[PDB]
Scaffold this active site. Sequence first.
Site, PDB file in Angstrom:
ATOM      1  N   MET A 232      15.263  16.817 -10.112  1.00  0.00           N
ATOM      2  CA  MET A 232      15.252  15.985 -11.178  1.00  0.00           C
ATOM      3  C   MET A 232      13.917  16.345 -12.169  1.00  0.00           C
ATOM      4  O   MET A 232      14.296  17.012 -13.012  1.00  0.00           O
ATOM      5  CB  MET A 232      15.027  14.541 -11.001  1.00  0.00           C
ATOM      6  CG  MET A 232      16.042  13.985  -9.889  1.00  0.00           C
ATOM      7  SD  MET A 232      17.642  13.807 -10.330  1.00  0.00           S
ATOM      8  CE  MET A 232      17.473  12.584 -11.699  1.00  0.00           C
ATOM      9  N   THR A 235       8.611  18.660  -9.717  1.00  0.00           N
ATOM     10  CA  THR A 235       7.325  18.365  -9.604  1.00  0.00           C
ATOM     11  C   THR A 235       6.891  18.181  -8.142  1.00  0.00           C
ATOM     12  O   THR A 235       5.597  18.374  -7.730  1.00  0.00           O
ATOM     13  CB  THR A 235       6.545  17.310 -10.494  1.00  0.00           C
ATOM     14  OG1 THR A 235       7.333  16.272 -10.021  1.00  0.00           O
ATOM     15  CG2 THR A 235       6.812  17.314 -11.732  1.00  0.00           C
ATOM     16  N   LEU A 377      20.229   8.895  -3.325  1.00  0.00           N
ATOM     17  CA  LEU A 377      19.603   7.511  -3.673  1.00  0.00           C
ATOM     18  C   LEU A 377      19.932   7.316  -5.323  1.00  0.00           C
ATOM     19  O   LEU A 377      19.730   8.041  -6.120  1.00  0.00           O
ATOM     20  CB  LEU A 377      18.034   7.775  -3.599  1.00  0.00           C
ATOM     21  CG  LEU A 377      17.196   6.512  -4.195  1.00  0.00           C
ATOM     22  CD1 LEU A 377      17.563   5.119  -3.637  1.00  0.00           C
ATOM     23  CD2 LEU A 377      15.808   7.064  -3.637  1.00  0.00           C
ATOM     24  N   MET A1001     -16.226  34.349 -26.893  1.00  0.00           N
ATOM     25  CA  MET A1001     -15.924  33.763 -25.433  1.00  0.00           C
ATOM     26  C   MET A1001     -15.388  32.017 -25.885  1.00  0.00           C
ATOM     27  O   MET A1001     -15.135  31.569 -24.927  1.00  0.00           O
ATOM     28  CB  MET A1001     -17.107  33.792 -24.521  1.00  0.00           C
ATOM     29  CG  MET A1001     -17.525  35.152 -24.353  1.00  0.00           C
ATOM     30  SD  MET A1001     -18.759  35.158 -22.993  1.00  0.00           S
ATOM     31  CE  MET A1001     -19.977  34.026 -23.561  1.00  0.00           C
ATOM     32  N   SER A1043     -27.711  33.676 -23.195  1.00  0.00           N
ATOM     33  CA  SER A1043     -27.859  32.905 -24.294  1.00  0.00           C
ATOM     34  C   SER A1043     -28.486  33.561 -25.599  1.00  0.00           C
ATOM     35  O   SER A1043     -28.963  32.945 -26.584  1.00  0.00           O
ATOM     36  CB  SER A1043     -28.865  31.675 -24.106  1.00  0.00           C
ATOM     37  OG  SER A1043     -28.680  31.150 -22.759  1.00  0.00           O
ATOM     38  N   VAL A1044     -28.345  34.852 -25.848  1.00  0.00           N
ATOM     39  CA  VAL A1044     -28.980  35.598 -26.928  1.00  0.00           C
ATOM     40  C   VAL A1044     -27.724  36.627 -27.614  1.00  0.00           C
ATOM     41  O   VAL A1044     -28.310  37.183 -28.373  1.00  0.00           O
ATOM     42  CB  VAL A1044     -29.882  36.519 -26.368  1.00  0.00           C
ATOM     43  CG1 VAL A1044     -31.074  35.691 -26.077  1.00  0.00           C
ATOM     44  CG2 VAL A1044     -29.568  37.281 -24.910  1.00  0.00           C
ATOM     45  N   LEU A1222     -29.119  28.750 -27.513  1.00  0.00           N
ATOM     46  CA  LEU A1222     -28.756  27.722 -26.415  1.00  0.00           C
ATOM     47  C   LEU A1222     -27.254  28.225 -26.006  1.00  0.00           C
ATOM     48  O   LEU A1222     -26.796  29.161 -26.397  1.00  0.00           O
ATOM     49  CB  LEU A1222     -28.562  26.176 -26.791  1.00  0.00           C
ATOM     50  CG  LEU A1222     -27.788  25.914 -28.074  1.00  0.00           C
ATOM     51  CD1 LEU A1222     -26.993  24.572 -27.777  1.00  0.00           C
ATOM     52  CD2 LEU A1222     -28.733  26.004 -29.432  1.00  0.00           C
ATOM     53  N   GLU A1224     -26.482  28.188 -22.470  1.00  0.00           N
ATOM     54  CA  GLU A1224     -26.826  27.735 -20.998  1.00  0.00           C
ATOM     55  C   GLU A1224     -27.635  26.633 -20.813  1.00  0.00           C
ATOM     56  O   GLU A1224     -27.845  26.096 -19.649  1.00  0.00           O
ATOM     57  CB  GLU A1224     -27.712  29.283 -20.512  1.00  0.00           C
ATOM     58  CG  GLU A1224     -26.713  30.386 -20.307  1.00  0.00           C
ATOM     59  CD  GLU A1224     -27.584  31.490 -19.612  1.00  0.00           C
ATOM     60  OE1 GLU A1224     -28.514  32.048 -20.246  1.00  0.00           O
ATOM     61  OE2 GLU A1224     -26.870  31.784 -18.633  1.00  0.00           O
TER      62      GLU A1224
END
EC number: 1.2.3.1
Lengths: 1290, 99, 50, 50
Positions: A232, A235, A377, A1001, A1043-1044, A1222, A1224
Amino acid sequence: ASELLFYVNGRKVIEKNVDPETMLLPYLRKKLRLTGTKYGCGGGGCGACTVMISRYNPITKRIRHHPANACLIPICSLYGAAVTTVEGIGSTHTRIHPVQERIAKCHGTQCGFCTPGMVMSIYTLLRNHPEPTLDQLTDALGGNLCRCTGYRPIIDACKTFCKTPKLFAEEEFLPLDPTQELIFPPELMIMAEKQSQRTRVFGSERMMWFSPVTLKELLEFKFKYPQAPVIMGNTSVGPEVKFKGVFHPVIISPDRIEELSVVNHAYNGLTLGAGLSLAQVKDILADVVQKLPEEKTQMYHALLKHLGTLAGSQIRNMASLGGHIISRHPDSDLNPILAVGNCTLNLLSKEGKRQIPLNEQFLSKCPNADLKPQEILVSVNIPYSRKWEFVSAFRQAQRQENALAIVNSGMRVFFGEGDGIIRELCISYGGVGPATICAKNSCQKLIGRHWNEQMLDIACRLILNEVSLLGSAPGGKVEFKRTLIISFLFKFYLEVSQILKKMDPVHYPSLADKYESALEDLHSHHCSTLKYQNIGPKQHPEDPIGHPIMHLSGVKHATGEAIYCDDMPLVDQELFLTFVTSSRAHAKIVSIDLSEALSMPGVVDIMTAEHLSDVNSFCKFLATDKVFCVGQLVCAVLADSEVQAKRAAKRVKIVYQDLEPLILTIEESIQSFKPERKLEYGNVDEAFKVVDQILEGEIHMGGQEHFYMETQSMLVVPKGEDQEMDVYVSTQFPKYIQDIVASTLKLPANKVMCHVRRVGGAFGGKVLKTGIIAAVTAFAANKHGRAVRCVLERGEDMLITGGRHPYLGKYKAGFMNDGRILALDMEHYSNAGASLSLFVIEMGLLKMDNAYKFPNLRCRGWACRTNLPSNTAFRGFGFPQAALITESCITEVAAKCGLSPEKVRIINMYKEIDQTPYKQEINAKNLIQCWRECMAMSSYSLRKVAVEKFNAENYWKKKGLAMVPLKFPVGLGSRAAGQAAALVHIYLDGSVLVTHGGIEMGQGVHTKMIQVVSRELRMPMSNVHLRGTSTETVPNANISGGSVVADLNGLAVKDACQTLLKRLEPIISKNPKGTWKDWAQTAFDESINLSAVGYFRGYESDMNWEKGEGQPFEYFVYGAACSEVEIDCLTGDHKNIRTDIVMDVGCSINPAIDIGQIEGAFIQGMGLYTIEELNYSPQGILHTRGPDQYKIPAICDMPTELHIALLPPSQNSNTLYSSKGLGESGVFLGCSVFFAIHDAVSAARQERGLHGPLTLNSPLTPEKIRMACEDKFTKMIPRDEPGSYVPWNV
Amino acid sequence: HGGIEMGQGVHTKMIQVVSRELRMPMSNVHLRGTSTETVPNANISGGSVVADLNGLAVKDACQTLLKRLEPIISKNPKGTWKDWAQTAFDESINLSAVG
Amino acid sequence: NKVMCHVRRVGGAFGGKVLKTGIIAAVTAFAANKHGRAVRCVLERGEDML
Amino acid sequence: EAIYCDDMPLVDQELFLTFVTSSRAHAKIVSIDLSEALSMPGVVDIMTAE
Ligand SMILES: Cc1cc2nc3c(=O)[nH]c(=O)nc-3n(C[C@H](O)[C@H](O)[C@H](O)COP(=O)(O)OP(=O)(O)OC[C@H]3O[C@@H](n4cnc5c(N)ncnc54)[C@H](O)[C@@H]3O)c2cc1C
Ligand SMILES: CSc1ccc2c(c1)N(CC[C@@H]1CCCCN1C)c1ccccc1S2
Ligand SMILES: CSc1ccc2c(c1)N(CC[C@@H]1CCCCN1C)c1ccccc1S2
Ligand SMILES: Nc1nc2c(c(=O)[nH]1)N[C@H]1C(S)=C(S)[C@@H](COP(=O)(O)O)O[C@H]1N2
Ligand SMILES: Nc1nc2c(c(=O)[nH]1)N[C@H]1C(S)=C(S)[C@@H](COP(=O)(O)O)O[C@H]1N2
Ligand SMILES: c1ccc2cnncc2c1
Ligand code: MOS
Ligand code: MOS
Ligand code: FES
Ligand code: FES
């Protein structure tokens, strides 16, 4: 024989002689070239493959739209249906749909990989509810996961559709026009209008698929092929065949048979058809409970409650009721409730009708109580409750929504007459055995007894006897499971001993005043405010620096037009690579047998370490004679397709021989020579002699999977000239990919080029292993003269790739009675996995201090080799671990001092001018200012007493509150590590192309570089364009981390633009009014170069680890975070009520993007410290199924209230436009939630008289919470001897 | 560079130029092709001057790289290009140049 | 900045791969953009001379 | 092994362009009829100056 006719995005699709094993997600991406629908996890969990299915009902004459996960839909079940995909609703080349516009423009995309799934969930709901409430929108997004945004932006977009200084202009969004939506394809309406009876048939060499379109036909196929599954929703069967090695040669998959869709409102109840979806049942039952009296709708409330939390909306709209009942999952949420409610099943065969009860024996699959192989069923009967009949359902899991149950229950009572003598009782539990179990014998013994506390004590014990769990049981969590069983039984007592008071107040007693909070569950609403600076009058209105400029790729994220690595088209004759990985933690490879695998269809090659010879190492890729962890690479299978490769990989026969010692934990790794890292400040040994109290303690901290939504993905394309390779890969470090591939091929670097347009999240986990896989992949590609693609599935990815380093912190702390730590002797231990990690220890030690001056400090660290997957660097890079351990030390001191942790935090804080353990001078003005503003905006002192007020008034629910400060130093090891480069061309039409070494990213680096170009060349952002990142354009670029990225590449981009202005100064002065087209043209005419390299040499940085002093950090990101929680002491659930964050960012280059980084980091931290947990067996196997499934934060986990403030600009003439990197930073601020929960547990521990050693470890899971809140139920449970059994975990 | 290989052996001559100016074998130099993404605004490959003019630009880039590396080369005269490139990176000296 | 042209090698030109080449590339790129597809145009010798 | 432009591999779903050219030296185009051509196998589009 039959044809498969359906629609996708309005266009007809015909497949002749179709393979019935074809799934929709692959079909869309590969056959239709519609790559907007993404692969995230392949089990329906994350919602990245969310699509809309449409169908016409020819009886009711209405089009029905529902959401679904495409990864589990077999295309043969789509006959006569209309699939709609992210591409279908709008595009940049047609017109953008409002949902697409708003999720982008509300900054609801970062990496963008989850955006299409979100869009289709939102779109689908809007097509059913054009005038929605926010609840309906957030419920639709219950199954949609995101690792970047923290959800708040997506929820803001949802609010714009609901009738009832900002980052986005809501008024400028074009209104939804429901009359101008996609028309359901008229042909499918015509097809449905003739109810064809022809049973459809599809086939291949492997599978036969029968779609009967009548009941008579269905039963006829159930007789012929009795063991064939009736698909059906797929899942239950889908995930089993996908990763439990199951195969079905014959499938029966009926169409909408009207008998299976019955909704009969009977006299004594109702009959629900087996083909109804769980979502449809939820609607049917929500309808009747609102229009019938509460006395009769008792069972329907219990089912509603658990249907509210059952997976997300996609799985509910796919999964059928009959499929739920027949599949008999041990952790089923509905079957325990059905078990207790006298429900009966309407069976039907070719040889007649039949009706059996739904009881424990049916749920345990006893043949005499089961269906026969030849019958189906049809429907289930769920009767109305009688007067004095009550039913309750309970569950606990890792999080409130979209997560499988650890334990659940259904429980019924019957009193009749009206007195308090209990006349019936059924108590079912799930998640405590292979099937759902009813305590039939306990209940039998309890018949005739009264409803009082004397029943509970005995009812608890014989239940604990009856539902036995062996200490070695599957799922683990044995002591917690035991407790939940009886804790739900306690909650059931309270619910029943209250409706009795309501109905019959004179006879039954009122509840204890403190006890009442046990009944109300922890619900949700999502409120937020975002404060930031908005410069300004001085600035030119077209200068984009400071403005909340949308992510350049944001709308393309929303339309699915953004190409990620696997979205690249099929390269002519490309092959597919997949790996055989190690199934042992520490063993010898006695042999490999590739005989069956090599002979199989499509297989081109299988490589072992032998076949790579001397190029099986760098600075070993494949295992040689031994394996040192599970998930280590062993073979590389190369085939003509993905399916063929995966198939052949499973028939590679490897035999092992386990080796001692099997090292899993950090303590085990402590028993040759490890290099030490050390920080000495002051004199710790003299300090211990002059302190009021000395305190020893420790804390363990778990790791963290990256859970980037885009799995490891690459395409490696040989050019066929001079051994040139082009490598397209989702990576953070193109230069490293170039090197490892070139090295492997024994080629100069000038032959190998690495190209990266975008990465769908990385967080540190797309570097070293990515290159290993790219090296192996490129070896194959070169060997066979073919393009080779390697894309990992989620299970493989988590096993092969590492995670964050698990830590162990040991501290001895000398301190004063006011709470000043004048002496501290710290030890860190990281769990390294199979390989080295020391980089992470170093940063651990350097950032360990955080907000506090430790005048005498001895901090030491050691990386520990174990037989687990080799862990990598992660967003935070040692600080989330190193900071937590010092807060743990602070919290333990606070307890001994009788002061709150926040008084001990503020007394130990760095002064405005001060010095670090490594002798660097710091200006901590903004540390102090962040702390004060966070206390003020959060109204900390007023809520503190509100929490103490609550805790004194509530026994089974507690609240907690904590504030935590942030110092995140930014800076790499050396100046060379921080160098960066760019390349800028101006074409003669005046337009600009820019590129640089940095990688997108999802952090919006490329957006910021165009903002930089716009300022420096004084031109609109529309006039600048960037394609991506490449070693062919900008060589020798450092890693995109620390962070740079924008910080450093921005300076290089600035440098290039200024070089271009110097040359054009003559041109610009002679023609000040001129356009860029004129200046570029007249520059060319006068032989002035319009191409320029940009370069930044890097921030000065150094660290002498012998002396333990230096200047490693260029600047410091300061902050503070307050968090509030409520816990459930009985279940171990919790809710995050409110979180306030204040943050020093300097001058934000883009406050939309920078606020998005804080939220993402915070939520990623929150997960690390609370709900994210990796389970490993005693043999080192990662558990990945059932309640062991790994859970990142969802919408339900997101704080109900969220305030974020940016501290006014601070002026820092050493960085790009005075900005602070920022990204991180905010991760650690999520431990505010950890210590808020820690506080809440302490409140229950003080009241109950449980003093002394309170060390709660991270992740602070519901297991750890509930077992901390000790009571009569924790003391009562059965316990096993420590070494008598082998556990499932630890 | 902006020049196009039509069979006249322009790319061969540019590698000969690079070999002289950086003092390295031709095997150590490589060229993939011509692109507006790498070198913008390049004139037509015609008029008997393609190698002639692009050669001067290729020469110009190599000399720019030597000026930067003069410190590096004097301290280590016997060194290889791998050593000079590595120690240039270690001291934050750019190894990409427009000609 | 949206359009990039890449050339590895040409199999002879002698002046005859400039203006008409661009006309054909312009028309070819119009089609490619219109239909969202890669389009290849290679002329036979008779066509080419004409 | 030297790759010239047409030696590049088949790009996924790529189409092919070819031109109808003039067969007269100096004439008026009174009409074009694309009816048979548009209906034929594989034909995606035919473009005129219009
Ligand atoms: C991501 C995810 C999250 C989930 N979360 C939860 C959760 O939180 N709580 C929970 O309780 N469950 C959860 N589930 C389980 C889910 O509820 C069941 O898999 C689902 O109800 C089964 O329905 P189906 O139609 O897919 O069955 P199918 O997979 O189509 O069939 C399963 C079995 O039932 C049989 N069958 C189906 N219909 C009939 C019929 N009419 N007659 C006879 N036999 C039949 C088939 O032969 C087959 O053996 C989750 C599943 C997934 C993938
Ligand atoms: C750092 S201040 C700044 C930042 C961005 C822009 C800008 C000024 N200008 C100056 C107008 C220049 C003058 C020099 C040559 C080009 N013309 C357009 C603009 C004015 C109007 C629209 C867009 C822009 S883009
Ligand atoms: C214009 S004179 C010229 C042209 C080409 C080469 C060359 C000298 N040298 C010098 C050796 C240099 C010294 C400086 C650094 C690199 N080492 C190899 C070579 C010697 C031996 C083999 C190949 C070459 S390549
Ligand atoms: N959306 C998103 N944000 C992210 C990441 C990511 O993969 N996706 N990585 C983080 C990591 S670990 C780092 S080091 C920084 C790097 O980029 P920045 O220096 O421009 O912040 O981005 C952070 N924010
Ligand atoms: N093999 C070959 N040689 C050739 C050509 C060519 O197409 N193929 N074109 C000529 C033309 S017309 C010119 S203008 C020059 C351009 O290159 P050069 O300036 O490097 O000689 O090459 C000439 N020699
Ligand atoms: C290798 C792997 C991860 C790193 C993270 N941060 N800096 C350098 C790194 C080098
Ligand atoms: O520097 Mo980020 O990838 S840990
Ligand atoms: O300048 Mo040569 O192409 S006529
Ligand atoms: S839900 Fe199908 S991809 Fe995760
Ligand atoms: S943007 Fe949602 S997963 Fe990265």
